[PDB]
DNA sequence: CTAGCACGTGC
DNA sequence: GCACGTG
DNA sequence: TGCGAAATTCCATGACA
DNA sequence: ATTGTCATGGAATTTCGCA
DNA sequence: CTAGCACGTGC
DNA sequence: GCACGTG
DNA sequence: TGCGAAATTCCATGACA
DNA sequence: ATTGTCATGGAATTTCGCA
């Protein structure tokens, strides 16, 4: 009955393995439920350690009341449970094989996978240096349901980097073929 | 020569008539209530004042008192200060006795991310291989990011700021003229991102007051947290960052976190006044909070201060003088007055230089 | 437990009656004009204040504002300052916000040779193998003797002073607690001659103000005389000594030479007012001059200063704190109050120690 | 017609050679004419150099209008003349073989030679360390003609080291014999 | 940005 | 490498 | 519409350099 | 072309609970 | 008591 | 030698 | 018993640490 | 058991030469 707020819920998940970029292989995805704000941390493994290393950074900024994830091994470990308990964070798991978040979080997360894959095309190995730009883009693009960007909802101001261009996010013809060759 | 008139009994402007001016031992002399004094010819006075001043390079009175031992003439001090004004060594060695004007108190940035203030702390005791901390303070909120580094380099600053600017890009970053921040490498990194670099006048940490003051708090917390324990701070940085970002500023009645996001996160003693409002209602409440913040005003001037004027002769303090060397450069001219505390001078090396008035004295005489 | 009375509707001193105190989620709660707050049982409050304070070791208001987010109870701040008073880390790390009292201005010594003030200047740039200068200033006159040495040792001080004390023996020699002056060797040398040694409170150069201030003049003259010339000062010492001993002090209207001997020697611009008097007439004129010298008075106190009281809890500033370490020792007690600016304390190592109040803060809370 | 003053005239002279004391052989004697105040500097030679070294020290304290001496080689040199001229000091010489000063300066100088010789008896080689005491003694003992000590006349105050004891200054019997042996 | 040097003193 | 400007 | 005390605000001080 | 700052704790002032 | 370190920049 | 207290 | 200007005194400021 | 100081130069005040 209370209106949703930032820091109410962080939706976390791993993406990968990706092609190696400066020795990194995975992306940890953190999405704030209320605002759609996304943090992306690169890791070497979908492990409790990497998760803890990265989230220890994020939680120096802000601590969520709740973290939500799939039943991934990194998030179901005892170590991760004790980590969360120490910081007063409640852990929440979706039942196995039935991932669930919200329309907003399903849509941002879809955007992420698609945005990552589009830039990963010519640059299979240079994705590390691009994580800042990705994150800025996602966070400065206008929601369908509400009129505001995530940035707007989190900070209560315009951004100094407004992504005026919505682009295609779909693959072009030349991109599709040079991406098909990536395997062969 | 022009003293002949006196011995005869004629009058000349400057020499009072009621005095008796006689001749002894080849010299023109006068009887004065302090005793009998020698009156030298105008052509000899400039050298007398020079000799007296040079004994110990004394200022006005201490120079006058020497001369007055043997001599009298009209307007002695006028001749004395003429000398003082031309003694290169006194001008570049003597202290100022004029205080700087009252400090400015620049408007708080309007929005978060408008202006960042940055600085390096250290060296610190080596901790897990690390020696320095990059402190980034957002002007409006005070929200502060701490990054541990192995050196105060551009390269470590870039790496650190690439992480930070994943959240948001600032309009401006202000720093001191640390080599790390003045490199063309950092110039380009900032240009590429549309960030304008703004620099403190040199040798004037006041100008990074926002971040410097934050350094104080960081160190004070670290210190306390390390009492009776070896000084290994690397693991404590995140704790301190978070702690300070959530600490109330009694004068504001808000934490920099609260000023950044408009709501506490899940930290101890989280404020929950706004639990019943929608985020929208919360954000507009935040908007009023940000605009209604207390802004301090410049203090009253001191009884004997100076404010610089275009065209004024002025002297920049020698940054780092060697032992037994002057503390001031030669006189320079005020080219432009940026505000009552900042000035452009054509400096001793013949370049336009922006300087704080605290690093200046007005040339005297 | 004692909160049961409230829920029922009974009254207890400290809890205003016009408020409604209900129960939710196992906790006793009150409706207040700032919102609904939790009232903890007295047995839980001491630990709540501890938790809130410890997040960033905040003082009164910044601690209160955290607690106030979730809780209310009568006289919250009384409990808060109780905590602040018992936090060892805040007491030994926090700065004072109380200024020292007004400085004393001790009576000028009556006679020459009553009190000498001594000090070492240096290291200086090596000049003819020499690195330091022993500065000896006679309190009454200001007459100053400069001795060049290769080290600030007792042995060089003795040698230097054997030369000086061939002219005359002083009653007292005052110095800082430099190793050269606190050695038992120098203790014996002084005892043998009937000279009483008097020492400044530690880390308080103010107390050797007479000689320190003279160091300023020495250096300023040396500097000027060495402009655009390599800094070789050894040969200039005698010149400077003589120059300064014959320099007028505008406020006094006399040179330290004149105050020493009552007559100029054969130096440039020698004063000769007394040429007609016998030495006897001259000496009694000197006697009146010495007694009639201007004596400055203590300034007005600052709006928020402290003066120490016997029995007061007080903290000595840590002389030379390591990086990230506290700047204050644990609280100590004022044993004796020598004057409103000097105090004896039983120090942190369990010894009687004489200290300047500038190196003290009153323990707060 | 003007009354005599301190710094009006310094009477200088050498005493020695003495037995070597910390490598020193001579004493330069400086007596202020008006006050009787004595400075004594040890030297290695009765040379212009030694004279200049020592007097450069004394003249950092006070400069005499006039220095007076016998026609000793150290004081008649060109170098010494230029030295004096640079400092505005007039040099004055007694005609050769007719030394002349004043009753006061003749008497102090006699005191010096006698005081030095008395302490030089048991201590032919330790006289260097004693020069301070000698100087203090001479300067703190009451004049016959006037009631004041030199110290008194120079500084206008009592001394903190009043030499209440006038001693013998004459030699004792044991002193005379151990001094006669000094040669053999 | 803070480090180091100097001396005398006491295991 | 090395001297300078700024922290 | 007034009193005593607690709560709040004021603000000199010092340390970041 | 750039510019001091703010936590701290006694003290001064205001607010509040109760008549 | 003052020295030194650090970086980036320009012969 | 080495650690400390003061400049 | 007054005016203008020169002479003197006043005193905040900074550097010795 | 010990304690700030004083040169400096604009500004404020006083003194002085002349009516
Ligand atoms: Mg997954
Ligand atoms: Mg800096
Ligand atoms: Mg000292
Ligand atoms: Mg002879
Ligand atoms: Zn000069
Ligand atoms: Zn604390």
User: For residue A42, what are its two tokens?
Assistant: 């690169």
User: For residue C187, what are its two tokens?
Assistant: 């203790």
Q: What letter would DSSP give residue B103?
A: P
CA distance A157 to B168: 11
CA distance B182 to B174: 11
User: For residue C207, what are its two tokens?
Assistant: 């107390």
User: For residue B71, what are its two tokens?
Assistant: 């001599």
CA of A75 to the centre of ligand 1 (A): 9
D109: buried, middle or exposed (CB in 10 Å: 19+, 13-18, 0-12)?
A: buried
Ligand number with the minimum distance to the CA of B121: 2
**Beta-strand pair B35-38/B196-199:** unpaired
Q: What is the dihedral of CA D133, D139, D144, D147, to 10 degrees?
A: -130
Q: Which of B274, C233, B147 is nearest to A61 (CA)?
A: B147
Give ranges for CATH 6.10.20.110 in chain B: 248-293
Q: Which residues pair with C38 in a beta bridge?
A: C29, C71
CA distance B77 to A104: 85
Which of C261, C264, C281 is the best substitution to test chain D (most D C-beta atoms within 10 A)? C261
| Upstream peptide bond of B123 is cis (omega within 30 degrees of 0) | yes
Helix H or strand E encompassing B352: strand B352-356
- Could you check: is the Cβ of residue B354 within 7 Å of any atom of nucleic acid strand F? no
CA distance A73 to A81: 12
Q: Which nucleotides of K are covered by protein (CB under 7 A)?
A: 6-17
Q: With an 8 Å Cβ cutoff, are A40 and B166 in contact?
A: yes
Q: Which residues of C touch D63 (CB under 8 A)?
A: 265-267
Contacting chains of B (3 CB pairs or more, <8 Å) are A, C
Domains in chain D and their CATH numbers?
1-184 (3.30.420.10)
DSSP string, chain D: -PPP-TTSEEEEEEE-PPPPBTTB-EEEEEEETTT--EEEEEESSSSHHHHHHHHHHHTTT---SEEEE-S-HHHHSHHHHHHHHHTTPEEEEPPTT-----HHHHHHHHHHHHHHHHHTTT-TT-GGGGHHHHHHHHHTS--SSSSS-HHHHHHSS--SS--------S--HHHHHHHHTTT-
DSSP string, D49-93: HHHHHHHHHHTTT---SEEEE-S-HHHHSHHHHHHHHHTTPEEEE
Find the distance separating the first CA and the last CA of chain B, reported in whole Å: 30
Distance B13 CA to K7 C1' (A): 17
In order of B169, B249, C227, the CA distances from B165 in angstroms are 5, 26, 51
Give ranges for CATH 3.30.420.10 in chain C: 114-247
The residues placing their C-beta within 5 Å of ligand 1, an ion, are A 13-14, 70, 72
Give ranges for CATH 2.30.30.140 in chain C: 96-103+302-363
Q: Who's near D88: CB < 8 A, 6+ residues apart?
A: C266, C268, D63
Helices (H) then strands (E): counts for chain A: 7, 5
CA distance D13 to D35: 17
CA of D70 to the centre of ligand 4 (A): 6
User: For residue D70, what are its two tokens?
Assistant: 């016998």
Q: Who's near A153: CB < 8 A, 6+ residues apart?
A: A6, A34, A35, A36, A37, A146, B279, B283
In order of B98, B178, B360, C275, the CA distances from B348 in angstroms are 22, 22, 13, 51
User: For residue D27, what are its two tokens?
Assistant: 């004493």
CA distance D9 to B166: 88
Q: What is the 3-state secondary structure (H, E, C) of A85-108?
A: HHCCCEEEECCCCCCCCCHHHHHH
- For chain C, how many residues are written? 365
What burial letters (b/e) apply to D151-175, b meaning 16+ CB within 10 Å?
Answer: bbbbbbbebbbebeeeeeeeeeeee
Q: Which nucleotides of F are covered by protein (CB under 7 A)?
A: 5-7
What residue has its CA nearest to the C1' of G11? C304
**Beta-strand pair A90-93/A66-69:** parallel
- Could you check: is the Cβ of residue B103 within 7 Å of any atom of nucleic acid strand H? yes
User: For residue A146, what are its two tokens?
Assistant: 């509400």
CA distance A41 to A54: 6
- Rounded-to-5 percentages of helix, strand, coil across chain C: 35, 20, 45
- Could you check: is the Cβ of residue C222 within 7 Å of any atom of nucleic acid strand K? no
DSSP, collapsed to helix, strand or coil, labels residue C259 as: helix
Cβ-contact C217, C244 below 8 angstroms = yes
User: For residue C306, what are its two tokens?
Assistant: 């402290």
Tell me the structure's resolution in angstroms, rounded to a single decimal. 2.8
Backbone angles phi, psi at B86, to 5 degrees: -110, 5
- Could you check: is the Cβ of residue B177 within 7 Å of any atom of nucleic acid strand F? yes
Question: What CATH class has B114-247?
Answer: alpha beta
User: For residue B302, what are its two tokens?
Assistant: 């001191």
Q: Which residues of C touch B220 (CB under 8 A)?
A: 57, 93-94
User: Other CB atoms closer than 10 Å to residue D86's CB: what's the count?
Assistant: 8
Cβ-contact B166, B193 below 8 angstroms = no
Q: Which residues pair with A27 in a beta bridge?
A: A15, A42
Q: What is the dihedral of CA B248, B251, B254, B259, to 10 degrees?
A: -120
CA distance A10 to A15: 16
Ligand number with the minimum distance to the CA of C57: 6
Q: Which residues pair with B342 in a beta bridge?
A: B339, B356
Does chain A touch chain B (at least 3 C-beta pairs within 8 Å)?
yes
In order of B293, C49, C80, the CA distances from C43 in angstroms are 38, 12, 15
Cβ-contact A141, A163 below 8 angstroms = yes
Q: Which of C124, C268, D87, C222 is nearest to B57 (CA)?
A: C222
CA distance A31 to A112: 10
DSSP, collapsed to helix, strand or coil, labels residue C335 as: strand
Q: What letter would DSSP give residue A28?
A: E
Cα diameter, chain C: 104
D9-15: strand order across its sheet:
D38-43, D26-32, D9-15, D66-69, D90-93
Cβ-contact B39, B72 below 8 angstroms = yes
Cβ-contact C357, C99 below 8 angstroms = no
CA distance D118 to D123: 9
CA distance B171 to A113: 30
Q: With an 8 Å Cβ cutoff, are C263 and D153 in contact?
A: no
Cβ-contact C289, C259 below 8 angstroms = yes
Does chain D touch chain A (at least 3 C-beta pairs within 8 Å)?
no
Cβ-contact B128, B234 below 8 angstroms = yes
Question: What CATH class has B248-293?
Answer: special
Q: Who's near D50: CB < 8 A, 6+ residues apart?
A: D26, D28, D43, D44, D74
CA distance C323 to D68: 65
CA distance B179 to B152: 8
Cβ-contact A53, A76 below 8 angstroms = no
| Nearest beta carbon to residue B278 from set A3, A35, A88 | A3
Q: Which of residues 313-332 of C touch strand E (CB under 7 A)?
A: 320, 322-323
DSSP, collapsed to helix, strand or coil, labels residue B354 as: strand
**Beta-strand pair A26-32/A9-15:** antiparallel
CA distance B204 to D173: 80
Cβ-contact D124, D182 below 8 angstroms = yes
Point out the nucleotide closest to B119 (alpha carbon to C1′).
F7
CA distance B269 to C49: 11
Backbone angles phi, psi at B291, to 5 degrees: -75, -30
Backbone angles phi, psi at A53, to 5 degrees: -55, -55
User: For residue A122, what are its two tokens?
Assistant: 């010519």
Q: Which residues of D touch C276 (CB under 8 A)?
A: 2-3
**Beta-strand pair B196-199/B172-175:** parallel
- Give the CATH number of domain B3-95; options: 1.10.340.70, 2.40.30.10, 1.10.3720.10, 2.40.50.140: 1.10.340.70
User: For residue C337, what are its two tokens?
Assistant: 């109050």
Q: Which of residues 181-200 of B touch strand I (CB under 7 A)?
A: 182-185
CA distance C330 to C344: 15
For D133, name the nearest residue in chain C, comparing CA atoms only: C166
Q: What letter would DSSP give residue B230?
A: -
> Strand (E) positions, C169-289?
172-175, 196-199
Find the distance separating the first CA and the last CA of chain A, reported in whole Å: 54
CA distance B65 to C255: 10
Give ranges for CATH 1.10.340.70 in chain C: 3-95
CA of C325 to the centre of ligand 6 (A): 14
User: For residue A151, what are its two tokens?
Assistant: 């940035």
Q: With an 8 Å Cβ cutoff, are D160 and C113 in contact?
A: yes
DSSP, collapsed to helix, strand or coil, labels residue C223 as: helix
- Does residue C89 sit at the B interface (CB-CB below 8 Å)? yes
**Beta-strand pair A9-15/A66-69:** parallel
B267: buried, middle or exposed (CB in 10 Å: 19+, 13-18, 0-12)?
A: buried
Angle, vertex CA B241, rays to CA A13 and CA B188, nearest 5: 80
C345-349: long-range pairs with CB below 8 Å, 24+: C345/C314, C345/C316, C347/C316, C348/C316
Number of Cα atoms under 13 Å in the Cβ half of residue C341: 16
Q: Which of D178, D65, D22, D40 is nearest to D116 (CA)?
A: D40
CATH architecture of C96-103+302-363: Roll (2.30)
Q: Which of A94, D181, B65, A55 is nearest to C268 (CA)?
A: B65
- For chain A, how many residues are written? 184
DSSP, collapsed to helix, strand or coil, labels residue C132 as: strand
Cβ-contact A80, B262 below 8 angstroms = no
Cβ-contact A134, A119 below 8 angstroms = yes
> Strand (E) positions, A59-171?
66-69, 90-93
Cβ-contact A62, A86 below 8 angstroms = no
Cβ-contact B104, B341 below 8 angstroms = yes
Angle, vertex CA C93, rays to CA C87 and CA C95, nearest 5: 110
Helix pair C42-56, C60-70: axis angle to 10 deg: 120
CA distance C127 to C121: 14
For A2, name the nearest residue in chain B, comparing CA atoms only: B276
Look up tokens 């230097």; give the residue.
C160
In order of A54, A85, A140, B25, C275, the CA distances from A29 in angstroms are 10, 21, 17, 103, 98
- Does residue C298 sit at the D interface (CB-CB below 8 Å)? no
CA distance A15 to D43: 94
Look up tokens 């409706």; give the residue.
C31
Point out the nucleotide closest to B212 (alpha carbon to C1′).
G16
Task: Give one word for C46, left, alpha or beta, with left for phi > 0 and alpha for psi -120 to 50.
Answer: alpha
C332-339: strand order across its sheet:
C352-356, C342-346, C332-339, C313-316, C360-362
- Does residue B263 sit at the A interface (CB-CB below 8 Å)? yes
Cβ-contact B354, B342 below 8 angstroms = yes
Backbone angles phi, psi at B65, to 5 degrees: -60, -35
**Beta-strand pair B313-316/B360-362:** antiparallel
CA distance B223 to B208: 22
Q: What is the dihedral of CA D142, D143, D144, D146, to 10 degrees?
A: -110
Distance C126 CA to G10 C1' (A): 55
Q: What letter would DSSP give residue B130?
A: B
Backbone angles phi, psi at D105, to 5 degrees: -75, -35
D119: buried, middle or exposed (CB in 10 Å: 19+, 13-18, 0-12)?
A: middle
Cβ-contact B332, B347 below 8 angstroms = yes
Q: Who's near A53: CB < 8 A, 6+ residues apart?
A: A43
Angle, vertex CA C238, rays to CA B81 and CA D151, nearest 5: 105
Distance D12 CA to G15 C1' (A): 61
């Amino acid at each position: 009955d209370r209106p949703q707020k930032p820091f109410d819920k962080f939706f976390i998940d791993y993406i990968g393995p990706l092609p190696p970029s400066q020795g990194y292989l995975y992306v940890l995805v953190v999405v704030d439920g209320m605002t759609g704000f996304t943090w992306l941390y690169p890791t070497k493994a979908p492990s409790t350690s990497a998760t803890v290393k990265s989230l220890n950074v994020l939680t120096s900024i802000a601590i969520p009341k709740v973290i939500h994830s799939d039943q991934g091994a990194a998030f179901t470990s005892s170590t991760f449970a004790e980590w969360a308990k120490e910081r007063g964070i409640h852990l929440e798991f979706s039942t196995p094989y039935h991932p669930q978040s919200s329309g907003k979080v399903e849509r941002k997360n879809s955007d992420i996978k698609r945005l990552l894959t589009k830039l990963l095309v010519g640059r299979p190995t240079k994705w590390y240096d691009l994580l800042p730009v990705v994150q800025l883009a996602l966070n400065n693009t206008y929601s369908p349901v509400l009129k505001y960007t995530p940035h707007q909802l989190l900070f209560g101001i315009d951004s100094n980097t407004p992504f005026a261009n919505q682009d295609t996010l779909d693959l072009t013809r030349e991109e599709e073929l040079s991406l098909l060759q990536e395997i062969r | 020569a022009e003293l002949d008139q006196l011995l005869q009994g004629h009058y000349i402007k400057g020499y009072p008539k009621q005095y008796t001016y006689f001749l002894e031992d080849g010299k023109v002399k006068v009887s004065r209530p302090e005793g009998v004094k020698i009156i030298p010819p105008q052509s000899d006075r400039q050298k007398i004042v020079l000799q007296a001043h040079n004994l110990a390079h004394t200022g006005r009175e201490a120079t006058l008192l020497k001369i007055a031992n043997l001599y009298w003439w009209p307007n002695m001090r006028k001749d004395v200060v003429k000398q003082l004004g031309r003694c290169q060594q006194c001008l570049i060695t003597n202290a100022s006795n004029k205080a700087s004007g009252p400090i400015l108190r620049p408007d708080r940035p309007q929005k978060p991310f408008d202006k960042f203030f940055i600085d390096y702390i250290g060296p610190l005791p080596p901790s897990q291989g690390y020696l320095y901390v990059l402190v980034v303070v957002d002007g409006m909120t005070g929200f502060t990011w701490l990054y541990p580094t192995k050196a105060p380099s551009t390269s470590a600053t870039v790496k650190s700021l690439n992480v930070l600017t994943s959240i948001a890009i600032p309009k401006v970053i202000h720093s001191d003229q640390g080599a790390a921040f003045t490199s063309s490498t950092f110039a380009e990194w900032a240009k590429e991102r549309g960030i304008h670099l703004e620099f403190s006048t040199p040798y004037h940490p006041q100008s990074s007051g926002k971040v410097e003051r934050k350094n104080s708090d960081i160190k004070r917390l670290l210190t306390k947290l390390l009492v009776g324990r070896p000084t290994k701070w690397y693991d404590l940085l995140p704790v301190v960052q978070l702690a300070l970002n959530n600490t109330y500023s009694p004068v504001l009645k808000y934490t920099p976190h609260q000023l950044l996001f408009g709501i506490d996160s899940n930290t101890p003693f989280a404020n929950q006044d706004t639990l019943d409002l929608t985020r929208e209602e919360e954000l507009s409440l935040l908007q009023e909070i940000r605009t209604s913040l207390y802004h301090p005003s410049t203090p009253p001037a001191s009884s004997r201060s100076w404010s610089p004027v275009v065209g004024q002769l002025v002297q920049e303090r020698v940054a780092r003088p060697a032992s037994l060397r002057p503390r001031w450069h030669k006189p320079s001219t005020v080219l432009k007055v940026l505000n009552p505390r900042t000035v452009v001078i054509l400096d001793h090396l013949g370049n336009n230089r922006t300087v704080s008035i605290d690093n200046l004295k007005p040339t005297s005489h």
